[PDB]
Amino acid sequence: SHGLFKKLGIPGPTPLPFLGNILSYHKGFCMFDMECHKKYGKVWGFYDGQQPVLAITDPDMIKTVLVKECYSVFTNRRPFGPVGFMKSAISIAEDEEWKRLRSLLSPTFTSGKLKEMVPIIAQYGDVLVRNLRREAETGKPVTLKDVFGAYSMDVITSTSFGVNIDPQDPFVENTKKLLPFFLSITVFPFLIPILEVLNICVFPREVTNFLRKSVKRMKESRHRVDFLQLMIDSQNSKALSDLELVAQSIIFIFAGYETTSSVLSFIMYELATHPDVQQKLQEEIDAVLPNKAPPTYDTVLQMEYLDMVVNETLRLFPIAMRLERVCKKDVEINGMFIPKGVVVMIPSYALHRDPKYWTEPEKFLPERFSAKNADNIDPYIYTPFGSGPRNCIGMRFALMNMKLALIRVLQNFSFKPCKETQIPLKLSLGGLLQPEKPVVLKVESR
Amino acid sequence: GTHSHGLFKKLGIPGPTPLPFLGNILSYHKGFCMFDMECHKKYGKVWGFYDGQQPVLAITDPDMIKTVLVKECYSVFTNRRPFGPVGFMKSAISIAEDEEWKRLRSLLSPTFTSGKLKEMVPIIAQYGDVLVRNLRREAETGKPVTLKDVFGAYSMDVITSTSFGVNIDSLNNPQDPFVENTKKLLRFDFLDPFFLSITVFPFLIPILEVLNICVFPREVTNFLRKSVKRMKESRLHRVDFLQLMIDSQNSKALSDLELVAQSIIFIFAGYETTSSVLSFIMYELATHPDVQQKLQEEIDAVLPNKAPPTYDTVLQMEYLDMVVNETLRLFPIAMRLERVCKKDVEINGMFIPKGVVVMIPSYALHRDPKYWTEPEKFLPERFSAKNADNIDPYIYTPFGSGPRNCIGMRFALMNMKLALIRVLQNFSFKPCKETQIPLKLSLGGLLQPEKPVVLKVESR
Ligand code: HEM
Ligand code: HEM
Ligand SMILES: O=C(N[C@H](CS[C@H](Cc1ccccc1)C(=O)NCCCc1cccnc1)Cc1ccccc1)c1cccnc1
Ligand SMILES: O=C(N[C@H](CS[C@H](Cc1ccccc1)C(=O)NCCCc1cccnc1)Cc1ccccc1)c1cccnc1
């Protein structure tokens, strides 16, 4: 089965029997996608076990997969198992169960629902400053992902459920240990039904239990029309069950906690290593919001440099790393035959650092996204939230929540490196995009 | 154990209680046919069972059958039950799915047009003479005759010459390798725990596929795989089954491995199906001497002085069409028709979930007492033009129905009728006591007799 790309005439690294090219993952997905981008060119292919993966870098071809032929050919991502009751999650669902869930959860982040969350988020922005003030008045490096993670958890648990959870919170402790042996499912695709029909999962049964019974506890009502109320009103009318309702809550809680804090930690590292960017960003926040005025919905979208700082960080650190779609039937997009079953992959990390696009890609330059220069970026090359009908459904919520946190913090504190601050920042050579050592920074009050 | 074993309980559809893991496969000890017969009597028009964990919905309503086979073929009921491990034979037209089958069906449909079929009558007429002489040596002696052997040799010669233009069996050669390999090409026996465990535990399929394990034996596939490669003799044609695939190959297209996959399907179907039905027909003609005489009287009336059969005289013989149809009613060699419900639908007021296998019990419907008077009896008068109006084409489906019916139906009807004519022109058939009367069907997988059909041959 390892002679597919040889048949189609698509280049790529030579696969080993059974393993394929997974031995090249010792450096991580990022370095493997970048080495293959320079060694082979615009299009290459490799094998995750027996699964052929076609990597495309042409923006016209990326648009065809993500946007044009989404509902027809490239609808679902790579099959992930063994899951179990998590097969009904919107990020894992396929075809019609996804389309019905995509439509059900889309009204969660409209321009009106997002504008309702500003006063709710404004409460936790003050606790974020007070907790940073205690570690700033006393000389002590601050683990940013811990203090940012506690803020991100309270935001998503209130904007989606209205419940207040307020250092050893069992939600943060259980949500974080969804973080080895996946080397086997990449090589054993036939062992998925062995664990599926037998009811075996990858997620530990306790991180699911704590959340499965917490949603059944927050569901006690007795609102505000939030992420939980949208799923209850349709439940009281195919339809959603008490198990699928829990499956969506785990996705929103994990995405609101882990993705928000990790990007915020990456932003503060770039601001500390570039004091000229942090100082210039602080001057814009003070101008739009004088006297430390509370940030509102409209004042956030007004700040251009704040949007340029977030965009450049998401360019350097795209937490998704890759974009993937499963070719459901034989197609010939942009004059290139793609058989059914091939996983079409877009190397987002490798494309965000392509020298043939970004001048000095390893450099942190927020001026790439200025309105003078944001005309020279391709929306299918810079894809930190994906694209098409199956992009990030919470892109607008994530961008607003992180900017509200960056405003409230940069109004009161400046961030400097420490002795133990890992400069330059080393990315985790493992699976997900994270720093090797935790991000520690000195917090000086203003 | 269960997982799905509550589906038909949820839908209110009756059926036998399934055992954990096994489902209802324990009830297959009597075969497909006797199990479908008892279920149709016990549970009525619609019932469901479980081939392991696979829910199977059996339908008997002609309108609902028409919706599955004809109306909703391209949109819902396109593919058959997934059969594995097949390996490279996945590209076979009878096994292909979705667009691949759609491209193959259109590619192979011009094989059996009325023009192409009429061109085959002179070719078949040659082997009809060898069939008589081979039957004559055994006729001059009171020695019994195993009809599956002599009809299988005739069928193998017709399928190799009309599809590839190659003569392999030169008057026999009774040790011909094409017949020896096609014989053991596939043997679905419930006894063999292989096909048993495949149904009970289907997650073993991707294991055997990557293990290069195939339900078709290696030595049999190799013999046919290299024979087709040998069967390519161009430059040297005549536009047959092989030429239609060669011409489209020299223009996606069909690879030298898919071209072999279709040949194996046509070779087996032309050898096994034609010879089996011919043996079933001759058994009924011997056990009913009144039908055999009336058939011989019509053949002599249309073809006097043993005139050679032509494409038009075959379609003229009405009683010959009645005998072939009544035998196909009693012995539908497929037994069942199956389609996989690719998405949730509600046909004729009945919800069918995605993944359920909708099955049409052709054997049970052909013997349904609420349609056929004396269904177990061999009465060709059911198909007379006086009575053929009272026959629902969705109850009597020996070749299936819809876009994915038997693509070689008209070829099989012509090839068998061309054989019955030339045989009955020169011989009459009688039982032998060693002939199993009544004919017991094989309680195993496929529709076959227990003891082979043997008959006495008398010349005229
Ligand atoms: C900086 C923050 C975030 C980034 C960079 C990010 C990025 C992404 C990307 C690249 C995808 C896949 C897009 C594609 O395949 O085309 C995705 C999917 C998704 N994201 Fe996010 N995300 C972020 C935060 C969030 C948050 C806060 C939520 C809250 C609910 C969320 C919910 C989802 C969901 C549900 C999906 C799957 C949607 C679907 O498959 O239909 N994400 N995200
Ligand atoms: C008395 C002889 C035969 C009978 C009763 C018979 C019966 C059937 C039946 C019931 C089906 C399934 C129809 C359905 O599922 O709706 C079928 C399919 C098929 N038959 Fe036959 N058959 C016979 C001979 C032949 C011959 C001689 C060929 C030569 C090529 C052939 C080739 C096929 C093929 C290729 C299919 C699959 C059709 C598809 O998937 O499109 N059969 N047959
Ligand atoms: O990485 C694979 N699949 C991916 C994993 S699904 C994954 C399952 C899961 C993991 C951890 C905690 C809770 C649930 C999942 O729901 N995450 C989306 C939820 C959070 C998020 C993150 C980033 C952006 N927005 C949202 C599919 C995917 C969907 C959307 C964005 C990124 C990735 C993979 C790799 C090799 C072989 N097979 C599968
Ligand atoms: O019987 C199963 N599948 C069958 C598909 S495979 C089966 C595999 C095979 C066997 C022998 C030689 C070569 C290939 C196959 O190609 N035969 C059809 C080819 C010859 C034929 C027979 C009768 C009428 N015309 C044509 C269903 C079927 C389709 C079309 C016609 C007849 C039957 C089955 C049973 C249990 C579980 N799963 C599947």
Residue numbers in the entry:
A (entry chain B): 29 to 194, 199 to 211, 218 to 260, 267 to 281, 288 to 496
B (entry chain A): 26 to 261, 267 to 281, 288 to 496
Please quote the paper that reports this structure.
To overcome this problem, we used the same strategy and co-crystallized 10a,b with the CYP3A4 variant containing two surface mutations, K421A and K424A. In 10a, the shorter tether disallowed the parallel stacking of the pyridine ring with the nearby Phe108 and Phe213. As a result, only partially overlapping T-shaped stacking with Phe108 could be established. That 10a has a higher inhibitory potency could be due to the stronger heme coordination (Fe–N bond of 2.16 Å vs. 2.21 Å for 10b) and more favorable interactions mediated by R3. That 10a was a tighter binder but not a stronger inhibitor than 3a suggested, once again, that a small, chemically simple R3-group could improve the binding strength by establishing additional contacts with the protein residues, but could not feasibly diminish CYP3A4 activity due to its inability to effectively block the substrate channel and prevent access to the active site.
Based on the spectral and inhibitory properties and the ligand-binding modes, we concluded that coordination to the heme is the driving force for the association of ritonavir-like molecules, with the pyridine moiety identified as the strongest heme-ligating group.
